[PDB]
Amino acid sequence: NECQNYKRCLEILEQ
Amino acid sequence: NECQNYKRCLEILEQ
Amino acid sequence: NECQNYKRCLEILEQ
């Protein structure tokens, strides 16, 4: 997998 | 998506 | 769930 959703969540939550 | 699992993991792992 | 993918992404991105 590409970590796409992980990165989206990281950007939104800032943690 | 809702980042539900991401948040669960973040809370457990504390990082 | 096991947070396996979350942990992989965390290790790669280092955040």
UniProtKB/Swiss-Prot annotation, chains A, B, C:
Source taxonomy: Eukaryota, Metazoa, Chordata, Craniata, Vertebrata
Name of protein: Beclin-1-C 35 kDa
Annotated localization: Mitochondrion; Nucleus; Cytoplasm
Domain of life: Eukaryota
